[PDB]
Every structure is written in structure tokens, then in C-alpha cells.
Amino acid sequence: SVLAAANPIYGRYDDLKSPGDNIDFQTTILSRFDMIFIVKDDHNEERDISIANHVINIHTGNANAQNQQEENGSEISIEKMKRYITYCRLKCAPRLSPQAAEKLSSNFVTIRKQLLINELESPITIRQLEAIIRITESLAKLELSPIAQERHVDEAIRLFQASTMDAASQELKRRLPIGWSTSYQTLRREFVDHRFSQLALDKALYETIQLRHQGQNIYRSGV
């Protein structure tokens, strides 16, 4: 089982151009992997202060290092975790549950549709389903139980969807192709200069993808 730790070219700018542009050879190696995670870097002053003093406490004054009462209350040792994995691997014989299988069958459809939406108007394989399905038994190996459950398996959908959505991700049209600045302020002006109502605006307005993108940006832009 292989564990990767890469660096795209030019650091954090690789996500500012098209979201691909990372492996120069091809994407078939990543299709032969299981989980792909993208680490970002966003400023949050409270998070920044917390990550600061958390790390100062790690270096000095052993504040995070309290752990002994935590040992008294949680995770008494690492070697304990190792002995537990040795016991866990050969004993349980995990397998999924039949009532949970129809859920995954209906879900792989939605992910492949998600790729259809981002692809045809503008890499998933069945090995991706193979990756989703094994995490279920891993947490099951923690529970040590021989069957699988509905609620015990669906947690994995959140963890895998988090790893691949980052992988995938008349007026307007003939007025502003770029679409910027032509929204509700300007649109209200243009229409004003006789059926438009602000409430009606937000209702009737809500497959021009320009309105979606404008919503993401132009909304708090004001116009």
C-alpha cells in the first residue's frame, strides 16, 4: 500500500490557473490511486493565533505535551494501537451488508453524473468505487463486528466526496458575455429604463451558468 506526498509546480498558484495542470505525464496514475487531497492555505486570524500558540505550546512549556491526564482518559499508548491492529487484521472477516449495497449503487451514479456536469458543458473509474467500499470495512475492523451496516458505511461517502470534489472543481447573454457588472443594480436599471420587482427579481432570476457564477461573485460585489 503506497502513501504519497507531492508538490505541484509553483506552489499555491497551481489552483489559480485551470485546476488541472499538476502531473505532467497523465492522470492515469492518480486514477490508480484511491484518495486525492488538496491542502489549501487560508488566513483566519483566530485560526492563525491558535495555530501559533498551539505550536509555541508544543515547543515550550509542554502545554500540549496535559497528555498524561489525557492518557488517563484517552488513548493510553501508541504501542497499544499497534497491538490492536495486529489483533484486528486477521480476526475479523468483514463484508458489506446487502441493505447498504443499493445505496452505493445509487451513489456511483451521482458521482459519474457530477463528472458529466463538469466535463461535457465545459478521473473516475470503478476503482474509485473500489476505494469507497474498502473504508467501510476498515472502520468495521475497528468495531470488530462481522457485518456491515447502513449508518456504519455512509460516513465514508463524506470522506470520499471531500477528496474528489476538490479534484473535479437572453438579456445577460446578448448584453454582457463576461456577465460582470450587468446584474441586479444594472439589470434593475436597464429594465427600469416594467414587470420587474425586486422580490420578483430574486424569484424569477433564481441554464445560464453565468447567473450561478455571478451569484458566487457579483452578489457581495453589489452589482
Partner: protein, 465 residues
Amino acid sequence: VKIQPPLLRPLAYRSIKSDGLSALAEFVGTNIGAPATIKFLEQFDQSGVKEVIQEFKVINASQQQRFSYNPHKMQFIFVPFLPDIEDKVQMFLTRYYLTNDRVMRNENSITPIKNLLGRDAQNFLLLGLLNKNFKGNWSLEDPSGSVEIDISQTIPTQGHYYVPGCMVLVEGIYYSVGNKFHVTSMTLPPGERREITLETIGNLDLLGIRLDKDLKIRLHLLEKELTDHKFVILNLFLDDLKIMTALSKILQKLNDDPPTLLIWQGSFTSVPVFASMSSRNISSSTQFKNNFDALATLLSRFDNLTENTTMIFIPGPNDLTLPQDPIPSAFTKKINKVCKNVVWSSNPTRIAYLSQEIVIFRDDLSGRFKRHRLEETRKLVKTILDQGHLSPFLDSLRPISWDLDHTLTLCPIPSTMVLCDTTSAQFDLTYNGCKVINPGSFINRRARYMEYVPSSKKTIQEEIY
């Protein structure tokens, strides 16, 4: 409870007859300490020792319990200012799962929405909430996905009342090519009777007494015998002489016949709150306080009442959105001082009857149903009884408090629901057992009111004009 009487006896010994000591040991036996039993026993002629050793409601909406449904165990748990978000989320989830178990009791199958959209061909009678997201975008929702629904050339049944914010059943095909689910016929999910329902609740408590012990025939017998408990039901204002005149003739009929249970309706004032001009030196508060004082004066004019009659207040739509805490004590101080058998129930409320489920709820359902249909009296009753809920509407229409939706849930089917409508005529009909009534207006019906007999379930109208 577990005890050892041989250990108990020398403690009890510190002469005393065996019969008295044994009797008190047996009787005190249910009470136990850790133990504290010594403290209670030391507290204790034969008559004095024998006496010394010895030592029907209304459900409060704000003080009721809370039970949560579990789809995995199919049972309820011991659940117990403002509520939480998790509660808002689990709100709609609980309704669908209760309806889910109701569907399993009625045994052409069950399948969620994602499974059909996961397929692409066909043929199912899907279950879900008729919501709407965009123009022509009539969505349906279960806990696994959404799907656009169409009623293009549909001939549904002559249902009770197809309304949005209602869990219904529609048959058709998916046809993912346009991704538009089609409807053959819209039908409503059937509701089963209260008999088999209460048979299958289990053996716990859903009303307040923990198990189920409704096996006392004396309850049914006493109701069949005690005709002493009569109900009186009266919209009712306070600032008109006509109201005073009506109360004069009413109290004239009540001073003679002593009633038992008064039901004072809502809407105690013709005007609402939110005063902003102090020209006439008054406000809605002072005016309402004086109206209560006038009502207290009319109530105190005849002291035959309250001697053996219990009273009930009901807050209306113009007091200081459902549910609603009652009218504050600050406006009922004088009436509470004069009388002693008063109560201030929430709207709605339930009367805790030893063997029956009587519920009282005042609102205008019919005044909203004509303006919200897709495309009579029994239709209304059929809707409320089949849906098993008081408010089948979205929260973006009727803002529901997150904590007490359980109170509003019609689990189970009640015995008699007092629905005081202000826009439909008065009636009383039966449908699968739950006797649904309607008193109608009270003033514009040329001064009419109702009086109900619980034993023989008789319904008589009483008019002064």
C-alpha cells in the same frame, strides 16, 4: 422492590405485635432507602401507629415530555432556553420516519428517490413531500435526494385536500432523458383507526401517569354513570355591550344549571397590540387589562359559578406562529384572586382524560385551504385525520418552534379534537372514530354556542336568538 423482612424485623423491634409490625413492614416495603428506611421508620394506641405508618387532568404543552423515534430500533427513548439547529434538522426527519412506520403497518413497494434516479428505465409509487424550488420545478423530497415532478395531463383521485407541504403518493415513471418524473395519479396516504393504532403502541405511556395500564373498566363505567361532567364551549370579545348582554343571558342559564367545564375561546379583543400614539392616554395593554377587569366584574356578578365548576382560558391570535405560551398573569391577577378553578392552556392543548384523548385547538384551516390547492367538510376532516398532523405546511409558511413539534404530532389518534374554526359553519361528524366537531362563530351566528356531553357523545346547539 427487594428487601429482607428477617433483617427488617429486629430493627422494627426496637412490645409490638407481630401483626402490626408485619403489616407496616409490608406496606412500607415499596418505599426504600439506600437505607433511608431507618429514617422513615423511626418517625413512626394501635390506631395512632396504624395511621402514622401510612405516610383526570389537562396536558400542559409547555410541560409535556419528549420522545424521539429511532428508525433502527422502531421505538422511543427517554429524551428529557431556545432550541438548537440539530433539532430543526431532525424535525422533518421524524415526520417522515413516523409516516414510514405507518406505511409498513399497511404492508407496489418502498424505494427511495436516489435509487430511481440512479436507474434510467422502468415504474414506482414514490412517497415524499410536495415542495417547490423554482417555476415549474415541483420537487419531491425523502431523506435521500430530490426529483422534479410533473402533473402533465394527470387525472388524480378526488382526494381530501392535495396541498403543498404534504407527504403524498404518486405513481409514474422517471425517464431520466429529461429527468422529469411523471405522475399518473396523486393520492393521499391512508390513515388507520385509533383502535389498532393504540393496540400497537406497546405498553408505555403516551399521555401521562412507566407503562400502559388502561385496563380499568371503572373508568368507562364512571363516564357512563357520572353525567356530572358537562362541557361548555363558546371567538369572544370583551369591549361591547352585546357581549355583556350575551353573558347576562348565558350566566342566567348557568346560574341555574351548574356546569362543569367552561371552555373560554380565544380572541379576547377586537384590536391587536403595537401602540405608538399616547393621545388618549392608553395602550393595548391598559385597555386589555381593563377588559379583563370588566370580565372579572361580570364574572363576580354571579357567585354560583366556580363553586363547583372548573374554567379554561384560551389565548387567541391577538395576545402578547404556533405553539404559544398563554396569557401572562399580569392581566389575570384580579380574576385569579376572585376565582379558584381557572387554568391557562396553550393553543393547542389536550385534556388528560383517564380513558380518552380530548384535544382543543383554535385556528382557521379552511380560510387557507381554498387559496393553496394544486388544481367538503368531510374533506377537511379527512385531511387532518389522515395526515396525522395539525399543521401540514412548510416552516417557511408557518414558523414552527423547534422544541414542541412533538406536541403537535397527532400520535396517536385522539378521541375528540376541539377545532374552533372562525370561517366555516358549525358541525360535528364522525370519521373512523375520532369525533371531529366545529362550534363555528359565536357572535355573527346570531349568538350561538355549544355544550357537549362526553358519555353519550351528544351534540346540542344552544341559541338565545
